[PDB]
From Swiss-Prot, chain A:
HEAT repeat residue numbers: 1-30, 32-64, 84-122, 128-159, 169-201, 211-246, 252-301, 313-359, 363-393, 401-437
Span of the entire protein shown here: 2 to 459 of 876
Subunit structure: Forms a complex with an importin alpha subunit. Interacts with XPO1. Forms a heterodimer with IPO7. The KPNB1/IPO7 heterodimer interacts with H1 histone. Interacts with SNUPN. Interacts with H2A, H2B, H3 and H4 histones. Component of an import snRNP complex composed of KPNB1, SNUPN, SMN1 and ZNF259. Component of a nuclear export receptor complex composed of KPNB1, Ran, SNUPN and XPO1. Interacts with SRY. Interacts with PRKCI/atypical protein kinase C iota. Interacts with KPNA2. Interacts with KPNA7. Interacts with SNAI1 (via zinc fingers) and SNAI2 (via zinc fingers).
Annotated source species: Homo sapiens (Human)
Importin N-terminal domain ranges (all copies): 20-100
Domain of life of the source: Eukaryota
Molecular-function GO term, any one: nuclear localization sequence binding
Principal location listed in the UniProt entry: cytoplasm
Recorded family membership: Belongs to the importin beta family. Importin beta-1 subfamily.
Name the UniProt record assigns to this protein: Importin subunit beta-1
Summary of the function given for this chain in its UniProt record: Functions in nuclear protein import, either in association with an adapter protein, like an importin-alpha subunit, which binds to nuclear localization signals (NLS) in cargo substrates, or by acting as autonomous nuclear transport receptor. Acting autonomously, serves itself as NLS receptor. Docking of the importin/substrate complex to the nuclear pore complex (NPC) is mediated by KPNB1 through binding to nucleoporin FxFG repeats and the complex is subsequently translocated through the pore by an energy requiring, Ran-dependent mechanism.
Region (IAB-binding): 328-341
Curated annotation (Swiss-Prot), chain B:
This protein's name: Ran-specific GTPase-activating protein
Native source species: Homo sapiens (Human)
N6-acetyllysine: residues bearing it: 118
Residue numbers of Phosphoserine PTMs: 28
Keywords: Acetylation, GTPase activation, Isopeptide bond, Phosphoprotein, Ubl conjugation
GO process annotations (BP): nucleocytoplasmic transport; positive regulation of mitotic centrosome separation; signal transduction
Residues of the full protein shown: 35 to 168 of 201
Curated annotation (Swiss-Prot), chain C:
Keyword Protein transport listed: yes
Keywords for this protein: Acetylation, Cell cycle, Cell division, Cytoplasm, GTP-binding, Host-virus interaction, Hydrolase, Isopeptide bond, Magnesium, Metal-binding, Mitosis, Nucleotide-binding, Nucleus, Phosphoprotein, Protein transport, Transport, Ubl conjugation
Small GTPase Ran-type domain span: 3-166
Positions of GTP binding: 13-20, 31-37, 63, 117-120, 145-147
Protein name: GTP-binding nuclear protein Ran
Listed CDD domains: Ran
Modified residues (N6-acetyllysine): 32, 55, 66, 94, 129, 154
Pfam name, any one: Ras
Main location: nucleus
Sequence segments annotated as region (Switch-I): 32-40
Region listing for Switch-II, in residue ranges: 63-79
Subunit structure of this chain's protein: Monomer. Interacts with RANGAP1, which promotes RAN-mediated GTP hydrolysis. Interacts with KPNB1. Interaction with KPNB1 inhibits RANGAP1-mediated stimulation of GTPase activity. Interacts with RCC1 which promotes the exchange of RAN-bound GDP by GTP. Interaction with KPNB1 inhibits RCC1-mediated exchange of RAN-bound GDP by GTP. Interacts (GTP-bound form) with TNPO1; the interaction is direct. Interacts (GTP-bound form) with TNPO3; the interaction is direct. Interacts with KPNB1 and with TNPO1; both inhibit RAN GTPase activity.
Length: 458, 136, 210
C-alpha cells in the first residue's frame, strides 16, 4: 500500500512529508529488493494516479543515482549485488511501462537511464539498446512510446561514460536522426529527439570525426532549424551553439553556405527565444576566437600552436553583424527593467565582445550609426546610439579613439540631462566607462582629476 | 482578473507625519533578545477623520509590505534611547503586522538628529492629543 | 480558491543561498548563522500586485547531499523554480548545470531564474563576464544579496510576470487592516516595562555594528 504514502509526498504539511520520508527510508532499509519490486509494480500499473507513478519512479532513480561520484558508484555496486531474478523482474516492469505515461516528462525514462548506467559497462542488459532502437524505429509505435524511448536514449548517452557505448553509437545516432527527421508528424517527438541529440553531442566525438556522419548530422540539424515549431527551432539553435563550441575546427565547410543565413535570420527574427540564441551563437564564436587568439599569442614563444585553426569568422562577418546588433539595440520599452534579459542586453554584450575581438576594425562599421542616431528625436534610437558608443570604447587603441573630445563629450553631457530616464542612465554608464578610458587617452594628467570629479558628479 | 480597485485603506484618515527611516524588531521570543532587522521605508502616522484614533503604519521599500502596524496609546511615554541621538524605542501590546496580534518592542533610526527630533515632537503631540481625548 | 498560489522550488547548492533569502521576505531579517537546512521546509510567501494577490508555496530544498532526503521527490507538480549559486565560490556555479538538468528532467519548461547571491561582500570570485550559463539556456539572471537587500525582490517579480502573463505587472502596496485594541493585567505590563528597559540598554550594541 505504498500508493497512499507516495501520494502524501505532494502535500505541503511538514508532518505528512516527514512521515512519508520515514516510511520510505524504513522500507528501503528493511528490504531493498522487495521495496524496488513493489515500487516498479506501482510504476507499471497505469491505473494509479500521476503523482504516485512519478514518485515511485523518482524513488527508484534516487536508489541508483547520486551527484557525488563515490555515492553513485556505491549505489551502482549495491544494485549489481541484487538477486538476478528480482533484477530481471524490475527491469522488465520498468521496460514495459514505457509508452503508458500520458505526461510529457516520463519518470520511467530516468529509471531506465539509471539501470543502464548501472549495467551497461558490465554488459548485463544486452537487450536494452536493440529494444529501444526497435521501439523508436517501429512505425506502429505510439507517440508516447517514441517520446519516452528518445528521452531514455538521451539520458543514457548524457550520463554513461562515452567509451562504453562506442560500438552502438552508430545505431543510437541513427535512431535519434530518424526521430529528428522532417517526416516525423509529432512535434513532441521532434523536441524529444532534438533534446536527446543536444545531450548526446559530447558522446559522439568519434562519429563527428567521420566526415560522412558529421556531414549528415550537420545537414539534419540545419534542416531542423527551419521547423515551424518555436521550441524545435530553439533546441536546434542550442545544438548549433554546442556544435560550434565543441567542434570549431570542423565548421569550415559549413560556415557561410549554410550557417550564416540561418544565424542571420535567427537574429533578425521577432521571437525573443530565437533572437537570443541567434546572438548567442556569434557571442560564443567571438569567445572561442578570443581564446584561440590567446593560445596563438602564447604559442608565439613556442613556435607552432597546437590547434590554432582560427579562421576569424567574426572578422569576416563583422560588417553584417554590426548593423543587425545596432538595429536590435533600438527595440526597448520604458517600463522594461534594465536587467531584464531581452535581446537588447544580448546585443550589447555581443557588440562589446566584437569590439574586444576585432579591436581597431569595429569603429568604421559602428561610428556612422552613432553619428546618425546621436540626435534622433526618438528616445529609443538615441539610447541605442549612446549604448553602442559606450560599448565600442573598450578594445580599440586609445589613440584611434581620440575623436571623442571633439564631438562625443559635448553631446553626452547634454544627454545626461535628457528628459528620458533610460537614455540618461545609459549615458551615465557611457561616461563612467569614459572615466576609465580617459587616463589612457589623456596626453597629460593636468586635467585628469578635475575632469574625473566633474564627470562623476555629472 | 480580480484587481477591482486597489485601496490602501489610508483614506478617511490624515497623514500627520511621513519620513524615511529604518526599523528594528526586538527578538523577545528568542533566547537572545538582541535586535533584528525589520525593513526600511516611510513611517506614517495616521489620524482617523472622526474617530480620533492615531496609529503607526510603516511599510518596506521595493516590496511595500507591512512591517509594523499598531495604535498609539497613552502608556507609550517614557523609555527613550537618550544615550544616543539617532534611535527611539517604544513598546506596543497589539501588533497586527502579520494579521495576528503580538507584543512587540521596536526601534527606529531616521538619519542622525533632526528627523529623530521632529518625529519625537510629533509623537509627543499625538500622544498628548490621545490622552486629552481619553481623559473625557 | 481566490488565491493563485504556485509551488516554487529553491534548489540552490550547499549553503550560500536559501533559508536566508526566504527568511528575508518572510519576516525580515539577516540570519548570520549557518543552520543547514534539514528537509524541504515550506514557507508561504504572499505578495500584492496590481493584478491581485499572489501566493508562493516556497519549497526550500537542502543543498547538502546527505541532508537532501527526497532528492528529486520535491520537484513534482512544480510550476516555477529558482537556481541559486554563490558568487564567492566558483564551485557553486559549476554545479548549476546539474541542478538545471535535474529540474528539467522532472518538470516541463517551468520558468527558472538564476540568481547570484552575496554580491555585496566584495572580492567577487565569479566575475560578471564569466557568467555565461544563462545565455546558453535562455535563463533570466540577477545579482542579489540578502545582506544589503540589493535586487532581493527582482526574482519574485520576474516569476510573477511570467506566470501571470502580464509584463507590466508591478508590486503594489499591501492593504492595511486596523488592529484590534486589547488590554491585559498590569503585572504583564510591568514585565513588559522590564523588557523595555532591557531592550533600551541593548539598543546601542546593534548601532555600533550598523
Ligand atoms: N544571503 C547572504 N548570505 C550571506 C551573505 N554573507 C554571508 N552570508 C551567510 O551565508 C550563509 C548561507 O547559508 P544558507 O544559505 O542559509 O544555507 P542553506 O540553507 O543550506 O543554503 C548565511 O548563514 C549567511 O549568514 C550575503 O551577502 N548574503
Ligand atoms: Mg539550505
Amino acid at each position: 500500500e505504498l500508493i497512499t504514502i507516495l501520494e502524501k509526498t505532494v502535500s505541503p504539511d511538514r508532518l505528512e512529508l516527514e512521515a512519508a520520508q520515514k516510511f520510505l527510508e524504513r522500507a528501503a532499509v528493511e528490504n531493498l529488493p522487495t521495496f524496488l519490486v513493489e515500487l516498479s509494480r506501482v510504476l507499471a500499473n497505469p491505473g494509479n494516479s500521476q503523482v504516485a507513478r512519478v514518485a515511485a519512479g523518482l524513488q527508484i532513480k534516487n536508489s541508483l543515482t547520486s551527484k557525488d561520484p563515490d555515492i553513485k558508484a556505491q549505489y551502482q555496486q549495491r544494485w549489481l549485488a541484487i538477486d538476478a531474478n528480482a533484477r530481471r523482474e524490475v527491469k522488465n516492469y520498468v521496460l514495459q511501462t514505457l509508452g503508458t505515461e500520458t505526461y510529457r516528462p516520463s519518470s520511467a525514462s530516468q529509471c531506465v537511464a539509471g539501470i543502464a548506467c548501472a549495467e551497461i559497462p558490465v554488459n548485463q542488459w544486452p537487450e536494452l539498446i536493440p529494444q529501444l532502437v526497435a521501439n523508436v524505429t517501429n512505425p506502429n509505435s505510439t507517440e508516447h512510446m517514441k517520446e519516452s524511448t528518445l528521452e531514455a536514449i538521451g539520458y543514457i548517452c548524457q550520463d554513461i561514460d562515452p567509451e562504453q557505448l562506442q560500438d552502438k553509437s552508430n545505431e543510437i545516432l541513427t535512431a535519434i536522426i530518424q526521430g529528428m527527421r522532417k517526416e516525423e508528424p509529432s512535434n513532441n517527438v521532434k523536441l524529444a529527439a532534438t533534446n536527446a541529440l543536444l545531450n548526446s553531442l559530447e558522446f559522439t566525438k568519434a562519429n563527428f570525426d567521420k566526415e560522412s556522419e558529421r556531414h549528415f548530422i550537420m545537414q539534419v540539424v540545419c534542416e531542423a532549424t527551419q521547423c515551424p515549431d518555436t521550441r524545435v527551432r530553439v533546441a536546434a539553435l542550442q545544438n548549433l551553439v554546442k556544435i560550434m563550441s565543441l567542434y570549431y575546427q570542423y565548421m569550415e565547410t559549413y560556415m557561410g553556405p549554410a550557417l550564416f543565413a540561418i544565424t542571420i535570420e535567427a537574429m533578425k527574427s521577432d521571437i525573443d527565444e530565437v533572437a537570443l540564441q541567434g546572438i548567442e551563437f556569434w557571442s560564443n564564436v567571438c569567445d572561442e576566437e578570443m581564446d584561440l587568439a590567446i593560445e596563438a599569442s602564447e604559442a608565439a614563444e613556442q613556435g607552432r600552436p597546437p590547434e590554432h585553426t582560427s579562421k576569424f569568422y567574426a572578422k569576416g562577418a563583422l560588417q553584417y553583424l554590426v548593423p543587425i546588433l545596432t538595429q536590435t539595440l533600438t527595440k526597448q520599452d520604458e517600463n522594461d527593467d534594465d536587467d531584464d534579459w531581452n535581446p537588447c542586453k544580448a546585443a550589447g554584450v555581443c557588440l562589446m565582445l566584437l569590439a574586444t575581438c576585432c579591436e581597431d576594425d569595429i569603429v568604421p562599421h559602428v561610428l556612422p550609426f552613432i553619428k546618425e542616431h546621436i540626435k534622433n528625436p526618438d528616445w529609443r534610437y538615441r539610447d541605442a546610439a549612446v549604448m553602442a558608443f559606450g560599448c565600442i570604447l573598450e578594445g580599440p587603441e586609445p589613440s584611434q579613439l581620440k575623436p571623442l573630445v571633439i564631438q562625443a563629450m559635448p553631446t553626452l553631457i547634454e544627454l545626461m540631462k535628457d528628459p528620458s530616464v533610460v537614455v540618461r542612465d545609459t549615458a551615465a554608464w557611457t561616461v563612467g566607462r569614459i572615466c576609465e578610458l580617459l587616463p589612457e587617452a589623456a596626453i597629460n594628467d593636468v586635467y585628469l582629476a578635475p575632469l574625473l570629479q566633474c564627470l562623476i558628479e555629472g | 482578473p480580480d484587481e477591482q480597485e486597489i485601496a490602501t485603506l489610508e483614506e478617511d484618515e490624515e497623514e500627520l507625519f511621513c519620513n524615511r527611516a529604518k526599523l528594528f524588531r526586538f527578538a523577545s521570543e528568542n533566547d537572545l533578545p538582541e535586535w533584528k532587522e525589520r525593513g526600511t521605508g516611510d513611517v506614517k502616522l495616521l489620524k482617523h477623520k472622526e474617530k480620533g484614533a492615531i496609529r503607526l503604519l510603516m511599510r518596506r521599500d521595493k516590496t511595500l509590505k507591512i512591517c509594523a502596524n499598531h495604535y498609539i496609546t497613552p502608556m507609550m511615554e517614557l523609555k527613550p534611547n537618550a544615550g544616543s541621538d539617532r534611535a527611539w524605542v517604544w513598546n506596543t501590546h497589539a501588533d497586527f503586522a502579520d494579521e495576528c496580534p503580538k507584543p512587540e518592542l521596536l526601534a527606529i533610526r531616521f538619519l542622525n538628529a533632526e528627523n529623530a527630533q521632529k518625529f519625537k515632537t510629533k509623537f509627543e503631540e499625538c500622544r498628548k492629543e490621545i490622552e486629552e481625548r481619553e481623559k473625557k | 480558491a481566490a488565491q493563485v498560489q504556485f509551488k516554487l522550488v529553491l534548489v540552490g547548492d550547499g549553503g550560500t543561498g536559501k533559508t536566508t533569502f526566504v527568511k528575508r521576505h518572510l519576516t525580515g531579517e539577516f540570519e548570520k548563522k549557518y543552520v543547514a537546512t534539514l528537509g524541504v521546509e515550506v514557507h508561504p510567501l504572499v505578495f500584492h500586485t496590481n493584478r491581485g494577490p499572489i501566493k508562493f508555496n516556497v519549497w526550500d530544498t537542502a543543498g547538502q547531499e546527505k541532508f537532501g532526503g527526497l532528492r528529486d521527490g520535491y520537484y513534482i507538480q512544480a510550476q516555477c523554480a529558482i537556481i541559486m549559486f554563490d558568487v564567492t565560490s566558483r564551485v557553486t556555479y559549476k554545479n548549476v548545470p546539474n541542478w538545471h538538468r535535474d529540474l528539467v528532467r522532472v518538470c516541463e519548461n517551468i520558468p527558472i531564474v538564476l540568481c547570484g547571491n552575496k554580491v555585496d561582500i566584495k572580492d567577487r570570485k565569479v566575475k560578471a563576464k564569466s557568467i555565461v550559463f544563462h545565455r546558453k539556456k535562455n535563463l533570466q539572471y540577477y545579482d542579489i544579496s540578502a545582506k544589503s537587500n540589493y535586487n532581493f525582490e527582482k526574482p519574485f517579480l520576474w516569476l510573477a510576470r511570467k506566470l501571470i502573463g502580464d509584463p507590466n505587472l508591478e508590486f503594489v502596496a499591501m492593504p492595511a487592516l486596523a488592529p484590534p485594541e486589547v488590554v491585559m493585567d498590569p503585572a504583564l505590563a510591568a514585565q513588559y516595562e522590564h523588557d523595555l528597559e532591557v531592550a533600551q540598554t541593548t539598543a546601542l550594541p546593534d548601532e555600533d555594528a550598523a
